[PDB]
Design a protein around this ligand. Structure first.
Ligand SMILES: O=c1cc(-c2ccc(O)c(-c3c(O)cc(O)c4c(=O)cc(-c5ccc(O)cc5)oc34)c2)oc2cc(O)cc(O)c12
Ligand SMILES: O=c1cc(-c2ccc(O)c(-c3c(O)cc(O)c4c(=O)cc(-c5ccc(O)cc5)oc34)c2)oc2cc(O)cc(O)c12
Ligand SMILES: [Mg+2]
Ligand SMILES: [Mg+2]
Ligand SMILES: [Zn+2]
Ligand SMILES: [Zn+2]
Lengths: 326, 323
């Protein structure tokens, strides 16, 4: 159909910052994660490199996407597809060419795909403060992020869902640990310590001629992948403004629906979640100034100059949101 | 028999309590009766308005979720750690250092710190792709699980012994209990001991001679090492208790190696009953783990723990002279 023809040409932009991820979401019938991951796996030749049967991959992605809540405005399968594709671009960057093995690449993309699976649309602090089953299970520590990992790995055990079946013993173990360290690092309560170590690595960065980056142990491979997926998760303000604003509308609706769930239980309303005292534009400027821009500036230095366009878009969008404040 | 149990329970403030007799005399309820006795002794039911029937009901529910078919990590071990932590809290070097809430957290954490232990290591649960290691992403799999169970059972019928604590009290106790139990993971032992060595070398005492602890970081860290010491307190106990603990942990290890054999996996250290020496295990366990830990704790509370440290070294030299 012309229906599938357009999705296929929209998917040609899969290597580009600013992929039309919302139209891909509509064209695929609300399967952006499955089609974007399939494309990225086709693009990186990962099915052959790891002997993943395509119907096993599709079956897993469909199951994985099924476990993102479609009634959650932001932390849904579109956000996962976006973080997947954003990590996929951040991996093709010139300063990181052939720095990561086929396995580590598989870790970064897989972690991005599962990094928010089964997100209920409420924050860790909410889950802790409501004495939820999730916070009880995980002892208030990275509650969501531990749950995303647990579901993402668990779904591999469903019928014809083990996309890692033809990986070796040690490969499965190394992939498992890397995905764990990556997704656990998406917890915003670790952002400051994560950013400090990224600065420390930047202060002492070592590069070849041409500008490819040198890491040596594992404690530096994983932290770059940690900050990369952390950057991809915090990449909305660096996307074209029309994309950024649709993400802003979605995160605010999800915040507000948490604030209503909070107000109806008579709880303290978390920052950003009260629709009756919100300042969406000022909040985006502060969020950029204090969180997103320090992160992406530090990432830009580490990969100089490959992330300049990304950083440029972020500062354009900051200046714009500031101008919407009268 | 209730008269004899009550008399053994008079030793609740003593190192070397006959915890195994109390297990027998209480109908395999050492955790319930020892916790109840300690709560009475410390007057915790009235301090925190804990109703007596609620306490007994939770304690027996908690004790039930320890496995009676696990040789070491069972309700007797929990009662032992509870009572050992109880004695360590009463040491003169810590008089009036800790609040009633921190005392409640340390004792409660000791009670739940190994609940629903299946008798196999974290590494075994990771290598066998267990549902527990799956749930907890291979990090402190048992310890996170003990915490989840211990807090979960407070929700059963008339089991919330914290129902009359204030909300911030509950919030403060919950965080302290989590920090304490997660520190019982032996993978955390070296860092926990390095911190304790740092605290000993930078030690501060008030006007009295009592340990000085400004902040949460130092206070929770002492409680972590305290419960960690109580958890690793078998070789410091009188030899007839120590040996029974050693027989139990060896049998639990051997059972883990028997399942490792029924799967062709590499057999964990000290789990191969066909290549195990109990005497060498105890000597290495004391020399590398228990004596470094207890010597450092003895420094922190010097000289309060001299008899405990003397008993550990005597039990060391009992192995030395008999191997
Ligand atoms: O230290 C800070 C941490 C955070 C922080 C912490 C957890 C957080 O979860 C998010 C978060 C996030 O994880 C994801 C987001 O999309 C936002 C967002 O859009 C807006 C904000 C926001 C804006 C203004 C505020 O006063 C507070 C929050 O937060 C988002 C941000 O936001 C700041 C916003 C500021 O304006 C100033 C700060 O110092 C901070
Ligand atoms: O890293 C280590 C962890 C542990 C460890 C872990 C879980 C554990 O459960 C116990 C444990 C415990 O909790 C209680 C015990 O009574 C013992 C014991 O008697 C003997 C041993 C033991 C002895 C030698 C070994 O090579 C291993 C174990 O362990 C007991 C100990 O023991 C060590 C003992 C050593 O001699 C050296 C170590 O590095 C370690
Ligand atoms: Mg997340
Ligand atoms: Mg334990
Ligand atoms: Zn996310
Ligand atoms: Zn224990």
């Amino acid at each position: 159909t012309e229906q599938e023809d357009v999705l296929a040409k929209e998917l040609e932009d899969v290597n580009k910052w600013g992929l039309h991820v919302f139209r891909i979401a509509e064209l695929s019938g609300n399967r952006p994660l499955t089609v974007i991951m399939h494309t990225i796996f086709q693009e990186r030749d990962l099915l052959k490199t790891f002997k993943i049967p395509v119907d096993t991959l599709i079956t897993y992605l469909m199951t994985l996407e099924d476990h993102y809540h479609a009634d959650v405005a932001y932390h849904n399968n579109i956000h996962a597809a976006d973080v997947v594709q954003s990590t996929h671009v951040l991996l093709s960057t010139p300063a990181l060419e052939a720095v990561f093995t086929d396995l580590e690449i598989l870790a970064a993309i897989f972690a991005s795909a599962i990094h928010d699976v089964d997100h209920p649309g409420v924050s860790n602090q909410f889950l802790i403060n409501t004495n939820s089953e999730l916070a009880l299970m995980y002892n208030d520590s990275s509650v969501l992020e531990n749950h995303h990992l647990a579901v993402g790995f668990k779904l591999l055990q469903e019928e014809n869902c083990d996309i890692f079946q033809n990986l070796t013993k040690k490969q499965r173990q190394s992939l498992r640990k890397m995905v764990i360290d990556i997704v656990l690092a998406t917890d915003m309560s670790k952002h400051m310590n994560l950013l400090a170590d990224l600065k420390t690595m930047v202060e002492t960065k070592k590069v070849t001629s041409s500008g490819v980056l040198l890491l040596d142990n594992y404690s530096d491979r994983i932290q770059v992948l940690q900050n990369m997926v952390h950057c991809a998760d915090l990449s909305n303000p660096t996307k074209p403004l029309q994309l950024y604003r649709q993400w802003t509308d979605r995160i605010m609706e999800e915040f507000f629906r948490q604030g209503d769930r909070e107000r109806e239980r008579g709880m303290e309303i978390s920052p950003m979640c009260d629709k009756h005292n919100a300042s969406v534009e000022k909040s985006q400027v502060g969020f950029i100034d204090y969180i997103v821009h320090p992160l992406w500036e530090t990432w830009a230095d580490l990969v100089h100059p490959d992330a300049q366009d990304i950083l440029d878009t972020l500062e354009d969008n900051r200046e714009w949101y500031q101008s919407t404040i009268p």
